[PDB]
Amino acid sequence: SEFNVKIYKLSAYGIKPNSGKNTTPLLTSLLKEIKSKTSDLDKVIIQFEKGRYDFYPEGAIKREYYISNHDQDNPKTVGIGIEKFNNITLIGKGTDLMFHGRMLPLALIESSNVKIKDLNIDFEKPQITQVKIISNDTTAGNIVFETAPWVKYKLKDSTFYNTGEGWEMQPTSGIAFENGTKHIIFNSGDIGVGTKSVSEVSPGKIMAHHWKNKKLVPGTVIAMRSWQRPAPGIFVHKGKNISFENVKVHYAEGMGLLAQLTENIYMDGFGVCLRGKNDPRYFTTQADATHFSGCKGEIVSKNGLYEGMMDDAINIHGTYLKITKKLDDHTVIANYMHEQSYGFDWGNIRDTVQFIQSKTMELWDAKNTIASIKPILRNSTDPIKEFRIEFTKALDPVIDPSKQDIGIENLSWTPSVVFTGNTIRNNRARGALFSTPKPTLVANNLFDHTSGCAILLCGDSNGWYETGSCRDITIRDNKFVNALTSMYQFTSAIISIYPEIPDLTNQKKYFHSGIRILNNQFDTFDQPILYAKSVDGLVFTGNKIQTNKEYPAFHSNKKRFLFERVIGVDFSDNKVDGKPIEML
């Protein structure tokens, strides 16, 4: 008021570091009061000190949230709820926010001009279980594994459970890592784990009686997990002008940062990573580091570190609805198709939409405009699965769900992207997924031993229902070091342009266009550099390919360049081991 900013040092308001008390009910009561006073014009700062603050489920808010690309288990146990609260900055000074149990650490809901700064999010007991191979008898298939120090397990009926505060989970798969390098072991990917038929040798030494894998040599560290992903580390819904400066998420039961329906996002020094060379842990998030579902405006993600995640560093995409019924020339019923992306809005009046022929992944050039959109809900308390959309223009009768499978992309909720000077390494699946028609720069990044392919441009309106016909994308001045040591969906080359197209031989229209790959360095042991399916306009120029033998060549695709349904190729000034490689 008489202050430009009101700054609350948290310690002046009964919230101290290293107290080991439950900070949840306190920060919750305090933010509720600061909000009930501060006007929308009013600028607020919440300030944490050097040290550790522990949050537990007790006294947390219970919100029903629908979160793109996550399990829809409700309610969510929310540690810090920033809801309908503007011009607010949470800052720390090497601050460690430590969570317990199954929680959503930080939720930013329907808030504008929120900045989060110099703060670190972690759980004490990750649902991921770290173990070390002690002995592997390849003949008998007996493996003895050592639980890491922080791990509290429980055997019942010869079954290995990992535990924390109010939770107990049996791991079903894992990722294996090289000792030391923390790389993912060559040709491993997702592997089965011996959590069935087990018995305790000695405390934290577990004998797996039926586990056969010649690759899990003594010393191998294994991140045992399930497929569960009920809550991200930071969830952002319907934000405008959101900032993250020097914020690290070290683990969460879900994605590091999941932002949806949010209009501008600025990230300098974001990390989903380990605490350095001394971190005993090999693993970070249970899913994607950073994920942006149906965002718009400008996304800047720069100078970040992403390591050891159970998925990609960044995935930027929309959701295709599937048309289930045409009511008239102007009105359709359209549906959310996937179990992990439903329950949140899809569009607003005046949004630009285009339609897609799901089976051949072909766009109709005829765009439209949403005139009306209302979710269809049989009971008050039902999640959004189904909309009734009205368009301003009338639909060509070729757009009838009873003739073929038809999808809708919202071209209005598409962000532009700057993804520069980041480091991605030692992570499961791909490095980076980009699915946006809007201009996209991917520059001066380091892809250091990603398990799968460095970059994936992929759309699909049949299985995952994730939009992404790309139209404008420069991948320049990057460094790709020994990518693709392991196979995962779509991992055909270091850079894979792989849309999911059920019927490619009958496709007439190219799905992706305007892709530029210039002045990159590829350090590789294998052959595949670029795979490209359904592209019109593909520039590959001034790139440098440097061979090494750090691992054996193995990929089924033995071609540096593999094109399927690709026109518009421009290919000059490229080299392999300093020798020119020309098309002509």
Residue numbers in the entry: 34 to 617
Question: Can you quote the paper on this entry?
Answer:
The B antigen that is present on red blood cells (RBCs) of type B only differs from the H antigen that defines type O by the terminal galactose unit connected by an α‐1,3‐glycosidic bond to the sub‐terminal galactose.
Since crystallization approaches with PpaGal constructs containing a N‐terminal His‐tag were not successful (data not shown), a TEV‐protease‐cleavage site was introduced via site‐directed mutagenesis enabling to remove the His‐tag after purification. Indeed, after His‐tag removal, several crystals were obtained and two structures were solved. The structure of PpaGal in complex with galactose was refined to 2.98 Å resolution, while a resolution of 2.75 Å was obtained for the structure of the non‐complexed apo‐form of PpaGal. Additionally, a stacking geometry via CH‐π‐interaction between the galactose and the tryptophan W497 was found, which often occurs in CAZymes. Interestingly the position of this tryptophan residue shifts if no galactose is bound. Furthermore, two crystal structures of PpaGal in its galactose free and galactose‐bound state were solved.
